[PDB]
């Protein structure tokens, strides 16, 4: 909310630097979408931390394509490795959190998940601007840390484990780019 | 309802360094080295002295000082790291012992002679760097809201170290204020040039440049071999 | 307020050498500083049983150095055995904490974290974990000094000193 | 700081260096306990030094473990050959004395009275000219016994023998 | 005063460029870089005279290099055969002279000493040596660059030089 | 004239016990010793040069005692190597200097002598170089106290120990 000034920041402030916002409405559209995209986007850096650092499950994720969960790339292409009578699952549970159990037209956010002495708000206010400023910072550090995953796949050609085992954390000097 | 710095582009006045994209209103004129250059506008969201604690993490209603701040202490070091990322492969290198190791200050790849010389060599370094960082922060605890950005008390006007005299006129003054800034926006694109193509290469910049300021060695004419 | 905790039974407000009564305009920044150097050597000391126990993570700290994380010493030695470019990594990060996130110009210490994320709501079960932490803050100063003075002094780190059992002082071979 | 306990016949308030030349009394009451902790620990040493130097002992047996109170040295080795299970307990009382019972808990009439009301061996006869100079006798007799014991020590590394 | 010590008989108040009035707020910067050059070329004249006439200290420079007084060319790549330790000797003692004691920003050269440690109290008899000192050292000037250019135009030493009889210009030669 | 006589760049007036207005009664006598240990000091560091640097008196000290002036050690020792027949003859003379020909006894510093048999009488001239004999004096304390604490921290004297090159802080 603009009020409380939730996403505001001390470092930036109401760092709103090209001027989107002009008037209130369209505040809680993209603060609907921001908090959407940041808890989206958070769960993917979760998975590319476990992904790339080998931590597995034992067995097969499809026992009758043979597919272990071992022999799943830890890198952009390891979604589309599952079966999509598998992942069809996927898209199913999470669209029906999406339309039923946190339905996403819920422009507030809020879906009443409260893990109450760890969020006391009505004793302590404070907490409760800490907590709403670090859904969002998070949440916008992690998008920007999946784009940065992303691409540095894209252009290396490596997933995150092996461009750090080669080191390959410059683009000077490479085979890669005019650069 | 609107943004604070909707605002700012609202008003929207002309730009000189973009004549084509209108700069925002929080670039007043006033300052040194304004040339209508923020097309993202960072002006319009300015940024307070947030290393003093949390009662100066915000930033004050049109006042860039630590904007400035941050942008003459990054171009201050990016002019004496020209000459750092130069003068070891023009005029030679440091000798070492057995103790720092031979060969510990001669690497003339100036971004692998961060890891060949001694760790004593890096710290004392930093701890010099700190020193006149921990001279800084006592200059703003004291002057507060008339803290003048990159002032560390060096030179000309009041209670200031000059041991050179450096008594310049009051507007002369204003030219070397602006000779500084455009030196320090020139030597921070210098820097990055030269750290990205030290990486390119891997070596130094007058061994590159020197390289190809040369004629090679097939190419050479055998030459005056006439009696 | 802030003067009198840090102050608990055994002594009192304890000040031998007088500068609570002298200099009370220094007093908050050395309590911050005191507050500090508490928190900078609990971490230390509790480092030290971590590194002196084997607990290391896996792989190579500097691969391009073959530096093992195991390969660095549980004592003294083991900080200036990372890399010059590893060590700057660790203070280009503790400087980006100690400046942005937790500020240490701010001196009462407190960076919107409670304790365990929350306020204390009680006036003084907030005074006594505010003593609980200058305390263990202070004990943990005495065990990180006392931690490397007696490694220099018997030339061993924790776990070589505790393995050859050099616990007596008086009956091993050192001034006197 | 002219007249109280260390003022003295042959040398009144001596004090050459630069330490109370002052009206702090805290800078003082503190200098004043220990001059005495440090003497009554002292005058205990040097009746701790010449019994061992006389080669007195415990009757015997000091553990178990078949060590006995006269196979233990005199002087700075007797610290080596003490059984370490018992060089613990030695500072462990010590300092279970020093931290808890030692103390001004209840408030003596001055410093190092550490009667708490507990122990108490008179202290009540005396006609209060009697008590602060039998408390200046233990000042100085404190204060003899340290230059006393530190003789001792300097000589028994010497091998001087006194 | 200081605008009139540098004017001499046979050309009086000489200046092409006309910088005395030019630039009157400059001169007393320029004096004082004149007399300091003339200063050191003064000392840099003396010492190739002294060099070439094979006047050395019978020792080691650097015994670690080897590197004995008499090992070090006398011309123009003497301080080119200095080891690098020994020139940072160099220039950490005359950053103390030239910043410290005698400081180079004090623009008049006036610093504690008078000739030969004399404060010459007649104006027109201390006028006279000041005006010997600026003619010495614009001499000097001349006379160390034609030294230096001399060498490098050669590739002989002036103790070569003499040996061999080159004096005549092989190139071409300016002398008085 | 004898406050600001010490008195320099950066430094200037340097005081940390403060004992400029705690003793304002004592200052005579203080500046008469430090302008007298300077003096002894300045006459010790070109002591300790002109001996390890071997320029010897080319015969015998001591031909009773069969000790020439080679045979004295250039360090520390140099003062015990003289036989105590010899140094009585220093300390009966310098007992007349001392109480009679320049008596210490005088706190100006000043005798018949002055600076190279020269009365300075531009006063910042004279205060000019009374603030260097003091200075130079002051360095030459601190000069002859690091001689003689890095001898017996190493042992060997100065010849010797520049001779192997041990200038760098190794063992300490
Ligand atoms: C999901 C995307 C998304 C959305 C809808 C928003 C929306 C908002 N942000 Mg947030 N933000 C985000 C991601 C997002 N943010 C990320 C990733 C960061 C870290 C860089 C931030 C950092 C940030 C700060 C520090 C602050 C905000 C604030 C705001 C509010 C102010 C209006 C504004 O600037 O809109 C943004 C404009 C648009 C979304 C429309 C333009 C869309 C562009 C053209 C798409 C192109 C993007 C490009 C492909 C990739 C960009 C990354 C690239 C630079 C590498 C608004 C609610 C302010 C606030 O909350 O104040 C109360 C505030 O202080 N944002
Ligand atoms: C154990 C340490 C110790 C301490 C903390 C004191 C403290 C004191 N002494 Mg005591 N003193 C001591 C040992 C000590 N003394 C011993 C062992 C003797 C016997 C030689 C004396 C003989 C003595 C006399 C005769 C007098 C004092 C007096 C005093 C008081 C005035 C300050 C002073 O001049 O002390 C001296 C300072 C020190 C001893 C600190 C030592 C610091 C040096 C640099 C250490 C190295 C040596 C002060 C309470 C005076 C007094 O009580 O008047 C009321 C007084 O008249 N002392
Ligand atoms: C009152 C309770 C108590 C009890 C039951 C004991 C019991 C013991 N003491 Mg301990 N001790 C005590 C209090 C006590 N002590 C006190 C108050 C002191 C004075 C500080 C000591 C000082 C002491 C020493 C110096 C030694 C013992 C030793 C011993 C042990 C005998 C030998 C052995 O190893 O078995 C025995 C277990 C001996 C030991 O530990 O043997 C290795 C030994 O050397 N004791
Ligand atoms: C170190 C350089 C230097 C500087 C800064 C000066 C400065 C000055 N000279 Mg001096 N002079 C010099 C060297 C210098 N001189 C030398 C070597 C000679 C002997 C040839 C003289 C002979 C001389 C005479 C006879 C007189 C002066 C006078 C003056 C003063 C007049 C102000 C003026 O307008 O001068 C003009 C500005 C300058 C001289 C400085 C400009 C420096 C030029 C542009 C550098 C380029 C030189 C060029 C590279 C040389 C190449 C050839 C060489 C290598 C052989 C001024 C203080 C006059 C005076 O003192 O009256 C009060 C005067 O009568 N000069
Ligand atoms: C300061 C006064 C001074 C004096 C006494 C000399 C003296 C000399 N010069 Mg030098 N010279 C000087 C300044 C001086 N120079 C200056 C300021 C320069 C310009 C930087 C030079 C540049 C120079 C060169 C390039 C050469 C000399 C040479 C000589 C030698 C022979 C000159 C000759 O006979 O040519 C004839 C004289 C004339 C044509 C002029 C009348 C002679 C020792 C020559 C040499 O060393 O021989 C191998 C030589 O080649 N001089
Ligand atoms: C309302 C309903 C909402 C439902 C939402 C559900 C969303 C599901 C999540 C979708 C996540 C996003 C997927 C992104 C696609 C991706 O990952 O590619 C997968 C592959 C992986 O390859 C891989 O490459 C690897 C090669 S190597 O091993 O690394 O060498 C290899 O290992 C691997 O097998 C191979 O697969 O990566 C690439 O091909 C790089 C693609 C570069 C970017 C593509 C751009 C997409 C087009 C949009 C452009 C803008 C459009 C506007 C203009 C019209
Ligand atoms: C309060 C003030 C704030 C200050 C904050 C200070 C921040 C700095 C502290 C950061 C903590 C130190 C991290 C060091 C990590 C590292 O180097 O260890 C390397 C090891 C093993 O390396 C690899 O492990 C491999 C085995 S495996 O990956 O574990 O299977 C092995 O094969 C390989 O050789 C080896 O390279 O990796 C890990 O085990 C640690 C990473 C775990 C994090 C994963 C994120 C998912 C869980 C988060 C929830
Ligand atoms: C060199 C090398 O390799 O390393 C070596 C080094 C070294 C040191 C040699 C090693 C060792 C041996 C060590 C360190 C052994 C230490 C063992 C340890 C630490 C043993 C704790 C006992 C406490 C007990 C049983 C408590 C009873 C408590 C009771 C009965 C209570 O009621 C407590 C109480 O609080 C309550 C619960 C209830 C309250 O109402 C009342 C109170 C307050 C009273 C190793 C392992 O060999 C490794
Ligand atoms: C921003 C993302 C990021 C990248 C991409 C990255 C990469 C590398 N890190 Mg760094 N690093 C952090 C961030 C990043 N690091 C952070 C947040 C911290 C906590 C303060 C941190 C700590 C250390 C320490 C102690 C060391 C270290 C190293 C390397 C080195 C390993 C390859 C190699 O060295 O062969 C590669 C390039 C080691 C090293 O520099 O060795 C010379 C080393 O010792 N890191
Ligand atoms: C008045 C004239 C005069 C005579 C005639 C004379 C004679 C002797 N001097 Mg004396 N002397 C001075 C004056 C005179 N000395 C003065 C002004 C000083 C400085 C204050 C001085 C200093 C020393 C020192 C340091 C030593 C010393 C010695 C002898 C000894 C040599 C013969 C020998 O020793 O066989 C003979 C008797 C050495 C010595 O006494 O050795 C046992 C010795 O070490 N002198
Ligand atoms: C309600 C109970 C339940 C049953 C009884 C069941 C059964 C199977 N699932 Mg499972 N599933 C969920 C629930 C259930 N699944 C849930 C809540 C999720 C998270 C949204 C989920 C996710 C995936 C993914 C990613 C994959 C997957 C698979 C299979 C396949 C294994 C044998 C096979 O290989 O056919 C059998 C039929 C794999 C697959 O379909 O491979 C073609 C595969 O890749 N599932």
């Given at each position: 909310?603009?009020?409380?000034?939730?996403?505001?920041?001390?470092?930036?402030?109401?760092?709103?630097?090209?001027?989107?916002?002009?008037?209130?409405?369209?505040?809680?559209?993209?603060?609907?979408?921001?908090?959407?995209?940041?808890?989206?986007?958070?769960?993917?850096?979760?998975?590319?931390?476990?992904?790339?650092?080998?931590?597995?499950?034992?067995?097969?994720?499809?026992?009758?394509?043979?597919?272990?969960?071992?022999?799943?790339?830890?890198?952009?292409?390891?979604?589309?490795?599952?079966?999509?009578?598998?992942?069809?699952?996927?898209?199913?549970?999470?669209?029906?959190?999406?339309?039923?159990?946190?339905?996403?037209?819920?422009?507030?956010?809020?879906?009443?998940?409260?893990?109450?002495?760890?969020?006391?708000?009505?004793?302590?206010?404070?907490?409760?601007?800490?907590?709403?400023?670090?859904?969002?910072?998070?949440?916008?550090?992690?998008?920007?840390?999946?784009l940065g995953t992303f691409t540095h796949e894209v252009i290396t050609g490596q997933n995150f484990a092996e461009q750090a085992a080669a080191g390959h954390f410059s683009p000077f000097g490479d085979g890669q780019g005019f650069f | 309802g609107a943004s604070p710095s909707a605002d700012a582009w609202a008003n929207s006045i002309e730009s000189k360094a973009l004549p084509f994209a209108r700069a925002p209103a929080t670039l007043d004129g006033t300052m040194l080295g304004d040339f209508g250059?923020?097309?993202?506008?960072?002006?319009?969201?300015?940024?307070?002295?947030?290393?003093?604690?949390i009662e100066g993490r915000n930033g004050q209603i049109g006042n860039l000082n630590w904007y400035r701040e941050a942008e003459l202490i990054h171009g201050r070091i990016a002019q004496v790291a020209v000459v750092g990322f130069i003068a070891p492969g023009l005029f030679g290198t440091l000798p070492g012992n057995e103790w720092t190791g031979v060969d510990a200050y001669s690497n003339l790849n100036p971004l692998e002679a961060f890891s060949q010389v001694p760790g004593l060599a890096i710290?004392?370094?930093?701890?010099?760097?700190?020193?006149?960082?921990?001279?800084?922060?006592?200059?703003?605890?004291?002057?507060?809201?008339?803290?003048?950005?990159?002032?560390?008390?060096?030179?000309?006007?009041?209670?200031?170290?000059?041991?050179?005299?450096?008594?310049?006129?009051?507007?002369?003054?204003?030219?070397?204020?602006?000779?500084?800034?455009?030196?320090?926006?020139?030597?921070?694109?210098?820097?990055?040039?030269?750290?990205?193509?030290?990486?390119?290469?891997?070596?130094?910049?007058?061994?590159?440049?020197?390289?190809?300021?040369?004629?090679?060695?097939?190419?050479?004419?055998?030459?005056?071999?006439?009696? | 307020?802030?003067?009198?905790?840090?102050?608990?039974?055994?002594?009192?407000?304890?000040?031998?050498?007088?500068?609570?009564?002298?200099?009370?305009?220094?007093?908050?920044?050395?309590?911050?500083?005191?507050?500090?150097?508490?928190?900078?050597?609990?971490?230390?000391?509790?480092?030290?049983?971590?590194?002196?126990?084997?607990?290391?993570?896996?792989?190579?700290?500097?691969?391009?150095?073959?530096?093992?994380?195991?390969?660095?010493?549980?004592?003294?030695?083991?900080?200036?055995?990372?890399?010059?470019?590893?060590?700057?990594?660790?203070?280009?990060?503790?400087?980006?904490?100690?400046?942005?996130?937790?500020?240490?110009?701010?001196?009462?210490?407190?960076?919107?974290?409670?304790?365990?994320?929350?306020?204390?709501?009680?006036?003084?079960?907030?005074?006594?974990?505010?003593?609980?932490?200058?305390?263990?803050?202070?004990?943990?100063?005495?065990?990180?000094?006392?931690?490397?003075?007696?490694?220099?002094?018997?030339?061993?780190?924790?776990?070589?000193?505790?393995?050859?059992?050099?616990?007596?002082?008086?009956?091993?071979?050192?001034?006197? | 700081?002219?007249?109280?306990?260390?003022?003295?016949?042959?040398?009144?308030?001596?004090?050459?260096?630069?330490?109370?030349?002052?009206?702090?009394?805290?800078?003082?009451?503190?200098?004043?306990?220990?001059?005495?902790?440090?003497?009554?620990?002292?005058?205990?040493?040097?009746?701790?030094?010449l019994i061992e130097k006389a080669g007195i002992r415990l009757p015997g047996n000091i553990s178990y473990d078949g060590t006995s109170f006269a196979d233990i040295p005199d002087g700075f080795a007797a610290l080596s050959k003490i059984p370490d299970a018992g060089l613990f307990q030695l500072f462990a009382f010590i300092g279970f004395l020093e931290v808890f019972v030692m103390k001004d808990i209840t408030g003596g009439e001055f410093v190092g009275d550490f009667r708490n009301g507990f122990?108490?061996?008179?202290?009540?006869?005396?006609?209060?000219?009697?008590?602060?100079?039998?408390?200046?006798?233990?000042?100085?007799?404190?204060?003899?016994?340290?230059?006393?014991?530190?003789?001792?020590?300097?000589?028994?590394?010497?091998?001087?023998?006194?």
């Amino acid at each position: 909310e603009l009020e409380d000034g939730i996403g505001a920041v001390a470092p930036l402030g109401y760092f709103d630097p090209l001027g989107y916002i002009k008037d209130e409405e369209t505040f809680i559209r993209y603060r609907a979408v921001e908090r959407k995209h940041g808890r989206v986007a958070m769960m993917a850096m979760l998975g590319t931390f476990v992904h790339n650092n080998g931590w597995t499950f034992d067995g097969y994720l499809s026992p009758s394509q043979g597919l272990k969960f071992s022999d799943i790339d830890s890198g952009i292409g390891g979604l589309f490795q599952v079966p999509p009578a598998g992942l069809a699952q996927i898209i199913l549970l999470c669209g029906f959190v999406e339309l039923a159990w946190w339905p996403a037209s819920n422009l507030s956010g809020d879906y009443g998940v409260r893990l109450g002495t760890l969020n006391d708000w009505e004793e302590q206010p404070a907490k409760y601007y800490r907590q709403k400023n670090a859904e969002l910072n998070n949440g916008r550090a992690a998008m920007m840390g999946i784009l940065g995953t992303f691409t540095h796949e894209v252009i290396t050609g490596q997933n995150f484990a092996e461009q750090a085992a080669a080191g390959h954390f410059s683009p000077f000097g490479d085979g890669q780019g005019f650069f | 309802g609107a943004s604070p710095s909707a605002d700012a582009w609202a008003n929207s006045i002309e730009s000189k360094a973009l004549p084509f994209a209108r700069a925002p209103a929080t670039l007043d004129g006033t300052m040194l080295g304004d040339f209508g250059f923020d097309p993202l506008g960072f002006s319009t969201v300015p940024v307070g002295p947030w290393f003093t604690g949390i009662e100066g993490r915000n930033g004050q209603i049109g006042n860039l000082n630590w904007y400035r701040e941050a942008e003459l202490i990054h171009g201050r070091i990016a002019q004496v790291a020209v000459v750092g990322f130069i003068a070891p492969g023009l005029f030679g290198t440091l000798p070492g012992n057995e103790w720092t190791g031979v060969d510990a200050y001669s690497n003339l790849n100036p971004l692998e002679a961060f890891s060949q010389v001694p760790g004593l060599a890096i710290l004392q370094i930093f701890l010099f760097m700190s020193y006149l960082e921990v001279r800084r922060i006592n200059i703003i605890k004291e002057e507060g809201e008339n803290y003048m950005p990159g002032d560390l008390r060096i030179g000309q006007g009041e209670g200031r170290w000059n041991p050179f005299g450096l008594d310049y006129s009051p507007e002369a003054y204003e030219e070397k204020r602006l000779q500084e800034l455009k030196h320090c926006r020139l030597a921070m694109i210098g820097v990055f040039g030269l750290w990205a193509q030290a990486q390119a290469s891997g070596v130094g910049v007058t061994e590159q440049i020197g390289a190809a300021l040369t004629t090679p060695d097939y190419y050479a004419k055998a030459g005056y071999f006439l009696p | 307020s802030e003067i009198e905790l840090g102050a608990t039974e055994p002594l009192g407000v304890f000040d031998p050498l007088g500068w609570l009564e002298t200099e009370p305009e220094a007093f908050e920044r050395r309590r911050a500083v005191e507050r500090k150097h508490g928190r900078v050597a609990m971490a230390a000391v509790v480092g030290t049983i971590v590194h002196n126990n084997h607990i290391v993570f896996d792989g190579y700290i500097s691969p391009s150095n073959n530096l093992k994380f195991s390969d660095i010493p549980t004592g003294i030695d083991g900080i200036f055995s990372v890399p010059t470019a590893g060590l700057a990594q660790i203070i280009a990060f503790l400087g980006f904490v100690e400046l942005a996130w937790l500020p240490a110009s701010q001196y009462d210490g407190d960076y919107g974290v409670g304790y365990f994320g929350n306020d204390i709501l009680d006036p003084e079960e907030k005074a006594r974990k505010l003593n609980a932490e200058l305390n263990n803050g202070r004990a943990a100063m005495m065990g990180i000094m006392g931690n490397m003075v007696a490694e220099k002094i018997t030339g061993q780190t924790m776990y070589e000193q505790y393995a050859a059992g050099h616990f007596n002082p008086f009956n091993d071979g050192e001034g006197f | 700081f002219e007249n109280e306990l260390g003022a003295q016949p042959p040398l009144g308030f001596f004090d050459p260096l630069g330490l109370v030349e002052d009206g702090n009394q805290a800078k003082f009451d503190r200098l004043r306990y220990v001059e005495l902790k440090h003497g009554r620990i002292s005058m205990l040493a040097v009746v701790g030094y010449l019994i061992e130097k006389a080669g007195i002992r415990l009757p015997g047996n000091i553990s178990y473990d078949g060590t006995s109170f006269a196979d233990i040295p005199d002087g700075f080795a007797a610290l080596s050959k003490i059984p370490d299970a018992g060089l613990f307990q030695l500072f462990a009382f010590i300092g279970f004395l020093e931290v808890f019972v030692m103390k001004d808990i209840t408030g003596g009439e001055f410093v190092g009275d550490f009667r708490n009301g507990f122990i108490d061996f008179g202290w009540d006869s005396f006609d209060e000219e009697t008590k602060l100079k039998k408390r200046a006798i233990e000042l100085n007799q404190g204060r003899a016994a340290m230059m006393g014991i530190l003789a001792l020590m300097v000589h028994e590394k010497l091998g001087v023998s006194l």
